[PDB]
């Protein structure tokens, strides 16, 4: 038994950084003493750019190829394919990816902060709820001192469907007293296709203002 | 100095050359085709330009060089130019989404926004025609 | 063919005092056989089978076994065995109480600001965090009555920066609910929550 | 009356019989064992009762009939009685979690809370001694 994955670029990389990449991730549920051959191909037959393996903490090999794509190329509807030459499945793997074509909706941003819990005076947890957007592709970021907090620092759920047509995520961010006793304002950013202008919706959030 | 020289298989009109390609292509695949033919998808700017194309336009429908950077919400020709001339069919653009960040031309020459992954049997390229020194 | 086995809901266990576990297996000649057995070798109660066809030509069949309250808490290991014509070597799933450190959940509950073009509806949010183990039951309340499970949606427990876990729950609400009685309770049943295995936060739409 | 009669392989003390089982078992598997033997996990109530048991306790450690309903936080003997007599080893119960909702007895006769999924090599059962008329 064995699966593989191919992930669209990050709204951030695409719309803002303007250098989107897709990644083909293959999870091997038991690695054999051979190589894996991740091959890239465009549905047009145009040349793919040059693309960019790890032992997991349970003896499973996880190898990921990061192919950088064209900004315009992607947005216009180019289909990208991942062909993985595996030594254990009778034939190959054909994972394929393209721009999700249908309705738009701009995301709703909400940022809160947790009330004080006794014995944790030095830290608080800020929540952000980003909802009613579509398609599911969205990038979520936290800001301070008008520089962006690194990715590890917070944790954002996989987009789930809402009761209606939208999608929603929550982002959770623990902050030290040092941080909010410098500038007591933290911005929750969401880069989404439908968000205008400049593909951005953001809320600002204060620990007891 | 007169401009009407076209390379073979290109039909001229005023100062541009026009190629009317055929084959099931998506919009972006329609885009590629014209680059490889050293032109670009068509950019319609004059009602006269539209009249000329309407008479060569596939009745199945054609792909034209109109779409948006998304980071817009506004349509723009593949040459970079804005929309001065428009030939919108009734009800169209249904855009704001929908969808349908790509503009297609019906048999009637009328424009309508259809999805980009949608496949159509024809597309129209253009390029600048070349000219001839005076004597 | 994968196979799965889920612990009871802390609500069934701690409050309802009638916990159930479920063996879920995600298809041809359906001679499927879900077998139940205790690691002690003691007799298991009678379980509830139901097979269902999914909206992609996959069969999803689940067996729900009811367990002893005390017996579960005290550490009994329950097992699920499956034998089948389209299966090579029988799948054997086991479940037991997660035996580890405990931490009671921190509950916080919000109602979302008014959105332009959406007057008669709001969205309530509930963050439950810093608890362990991950097993946790989330519920929403209104006028003595517990809101139906479909009404809200709660995330799979993710690890926190520290040692605990966190879940979020999301709840869309009508004007007639809050104008009637503008109080909505977010309730957590968790193992470590004292007294009587409950933590809850009350939240009002514009209090 | 006089009560000191025990069924075979059971050791007597005061008005009760005690079985010192041996075998790798978890706390609840150790509880089962005692049921099958028509007794229950041991419930210690007097310093003399503990002193008796200390002499027969395996070095490896032993399972005793003390735990909680969780819907407590407070330990209770499998016979239903609360804790009147206690023989906690120092810094124990480490409970309040941790976890360790089950109590074991050391070689020393001292008690310590250990996790219930841990497997120990001995357990002690009890039952009421029978009487000679
Ligand atoms: Ca349309
Ligand atoms: Ca201890």
Numbering used by the authors:
A (entry chain A): 335 to 386, 389 to 545
B (entry chain G): 158 to 292
C (entry chain B): 336 to 361, 365 to 545
D (entry chain H): 158 to 290
What does the paper say about this structure?
The second principal receptor for IgE, CD23, is a type II transmembrane glycoprotein with a C-type lectin-like domain (CTLD)4 (3, 4). In its membrane-bound form, CD23 consists of three CTLD “heads” connected to the membrane via a trimeric α-helical coiled-coil “stalk”. The interaction between CD23 and IgE is critical in the regulation of IgE synthesis, which can be up- or down-regulated depending on the oligomerization state of CD23 (2, 9, 10). We have determined the crystal structures of the human lectin-like head domain of CD23 in its Ca2+-free and Ca2+-bound forms, as well as the crystal structure of the Ca2+-bound head domain of CD23 in complex with a subfragment of IgE-Fc consisting of the dimer of Cϵ3 and Cϵ4 domains (Fcϵ3-4).
The Ca2+-bound derCD23-Fcϵ3-4 complex crystallized in essentially the same crystal form as the previously reported Ca2+-free complex, but with a 2% increase in the length of the c-axis. In the derCD23-Fcϵ3-4 complex structure, there are three independent complexes per asymmetric unit. The six heavy chains of Fcϵ3-4 (labeled A–F) are bound to six derCD23 molecules (labeled G–L). Fcϵ3-4 is in a very “closed” conformation when bound to derCD23. The angle between the Cϵ3 and Cϵ4 domains in the Ca2+-bound derCD23-Fcϵ3-4 complex differ by only 5°, similar to the range observed in the Ca2+-free complex structure. This closed conformation allosterically precludes binding to FcϵRI. In contrast, electron density is observed for the entire loop, including residues Ser-256 and Glu-257, in all six copies of derCD23 in the Ca2+-bound complex. All four salt bridges and two of the four additional hydrogen bonds observed in the Ca2+-free complex are retained in the Ca2+-bound complex; the two hydrogen bonds lost are between Ser-254 (derCD23) and Arg-440 (Fcϵ3-4). However, in the Ca2+-bound complex, there are two additional salt bridges (both Asp-227 and Asp-258 with Arg-440) and two new hydrogen bonds formed (Gln-255 to Arg-440 and Cys-273 to Ser-437). Arg-440, in the Cϵ3-Cϵ4 linker region, is key to these additional interactions with Asp-227 (loop 1) and Asp-258 (loop 4) following Ca2+-induced ordering and conformational change in loop 4.
